Symmetry: C2
Subunit: 372 residues, 2 copies
């Protein structure tokens, strides 16, 4: 399908994003759910999918990790099924992501869907990331509190919650409504009628993850192999001392390495292009030869990107799922990065180059793009 967002973007980015939560009423007009609770359940039965059941009985909370062989015995009440990264396994669901391209592809994460019977829900909780929560069929009561430091507690080892909060937002969401929550704002919501919620999640790294990742990149690629050297080595009163100048030199090594021109860009390119959830990956059973891709495309057949596969451009280099793609043909690479559903027109003269055709062949044979 194709989904149309009624949001006013400049106003939102200016006043709201990464600042304050909002309820965007009728974000989607005449909202038609991309998927059904049944299709979602069947999808949760699959073993490659990350899914979980969260139920609560009076005070007690029970969290069960999927997949599942059974719809019984659950209840008419007080439970919810959560499925991560549906946009990987379902194309119509993947369509929901497109309207959010007004925000950077690299910051966006994936689409997680929850189905809840009345009373069903995940409880009050905090996130470290921005989220858009889209109301599907049914209705839920959503509550968001002010952003204040609060202790996280665990009703279950597998389930994070906070203490109940005074809501700065308390509302019932109709289908098509969207609730934007910046990180740090406690929120809770629960089904009134049988409900479907679509969370477009976002991702941002912290410093720990960055320095760790890059350290592993340096180790793996065997970089930064230059040793500390002191032909000028300074005198000292006490031989057990390590002088401030030496510490400074030592750290200056790390800073210098971090600032080496290609290395950081390349590492981050390989990192950020990787998905936090498992892709659906099925390399073409026989591999493709370059000229049947050439032919297929020229024959009118269309190339489409695997749902959830991240393609990002940093400078003149492109990165698809951890792998750097480097080609002299810019329009083609731009076509690969900024739109799914590619046709020969988007490639231009690139297909004539056997090198580009070879690369493209390797990308398709990898499962990253497939024919329609």
């Amino acid at each position: 399908m194709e989904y149309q967002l009624t949001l006013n973007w400049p106003d939102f980015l200016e006043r709201h994003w990464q600042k304050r939560p909002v309820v965007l009423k009728r974000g989607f007009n005449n909202f038609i759910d991309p998927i059904s609770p049944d299709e979602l359940a069947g999808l949760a039965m699959e073993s490659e999918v990350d899914s979980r059941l969260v139920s609560h009985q009076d005070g007690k909370w029970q969290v069960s990790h999927g997949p599942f062989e059974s719809y019984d015995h659950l209840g008419e009440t007080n439970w919810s099924l959560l499925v991560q990264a549906v946009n990987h396994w379902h194309e119509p669901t993947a369509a929901l992501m497109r309207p959010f391209r007004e925000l950077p592809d690299w910051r966006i994460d994936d689409l997680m869907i929850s189905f809840s019977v009345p009373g069903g829900g995940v409880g009050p909780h905090l996130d470290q990331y921005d989220v858009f929560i889209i109301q599907g069929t049914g209705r839920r009561r959503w509550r968001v509190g002010e952003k204040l430091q609060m202790k996280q507690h665990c009703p279950h080892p597998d389930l994070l919650q906070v203490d109940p909060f005074e809501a700065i937002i308390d509302e019932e969401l109709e289908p098509g409504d969207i609730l934007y929550i910046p990180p740090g704002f406690p929120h809770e919501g629960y089904a009134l009628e049988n409900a479907m919620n679509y969370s477009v999640g976002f991702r941002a790294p912290n410093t720990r993850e960055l320095i760790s990742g890059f350290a592993d990149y340096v180790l793996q690629r065997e970089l930064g192999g230059n040793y500390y050297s002191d032909p000028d080595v300074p005198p000292r009163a006490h031989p057990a001392d390590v002088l401030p100048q030496e510490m400074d030199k030592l750290r200056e090594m790390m800073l210098e390495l971090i600032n080496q021109p290609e290395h950081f860009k390349q590492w981050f390119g390989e990192f950020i292009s990787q998905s936090r959830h498992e892709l659906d990956i099925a390399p073409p059973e026989p591999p493709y030869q370059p000229d049947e891709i050439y032919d297929a495309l020229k024959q009118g057949e269309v190339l489409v990107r695997l749902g959830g596969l991240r393609v990002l451009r940093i400078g003149d280099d492109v990165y698809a799922n951890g792998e750097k793609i480097d080609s002299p043909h810019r329009p083609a690479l731009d076509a690969l990065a900024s739109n799914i559903a590619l046709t020969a027109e988007n490639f231009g003269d690139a297909l004539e180059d056997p090198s580009f055709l070879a690369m493209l062949a390797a990308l398709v044979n990898s499962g990253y793009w497939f024919f329609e």
Copy 2:
């Protein structure tokens, strides 16, 4: 005994250290060996001690590792035995380290001893570390090359090398010292039965700094702050990552690194650790603080465990991967400055109970022993 290096130190550090290799003729006058070859073999058989044995049947070599038994077996000619960190074990060998205190404690590693029967040698190897090779008990032929300078390929470190043209070729007598910087290919082998005492040095490369610091960051779970973009910049293509964003991220990292306390503490814990296993046997019954106090004021002498690294950063003291929590700058400064302390070395600090409780804990860790 207690060794006196005859060396012009200003001239060495100025013209030589980390620059050019030299043969220092009669680096030691009347050089008596700290240890006998059979004693060395006595250590070569041990569970904890790191040894190795290298033999060349011409054109081909064989290497075995410790512990050891039955040296016959075989060999008369053409083999060598090598033992790491002998100063961690044999106390008079650690005294051979004292003259090199003219160089920083943090850059010094340890002393390895190699006994080679005639023809015995390790082959033309290469190091990324500085080394002083002290000749004793017999003679060896040493040759040192010109340090070739492999574009963008990692240096293999200790991996073996080419039959170089020698900028240095000679035969060492007892007391002779061959200093080599990192990068200079070198080979040596025994003529008469030969003892070599190689005092080595250690430097971190950038990779080790970044890995260590990263691990430390994970452990204390620091840098928890998340990248945020209230102002997030517009772009032509939704798939693009702008330079200003890359700068945001990079500066997050640089900021974490330039936080002084964390880097300081981590490195203090990192550099105070030893590259080889120490001898650690805490007193079977411990000492009460009063026992320490008393015995210490009886004129007894505490000595730092051989090979144990104690280093000062700012005013902070680190002993074997751990900080020492304490005031009394003179006393801790003494703990780092002198191996073999006395009551006079501490002075006033002994009357503070909180101080000697700590010190007693140091002794009980096995980091200092009486003699």
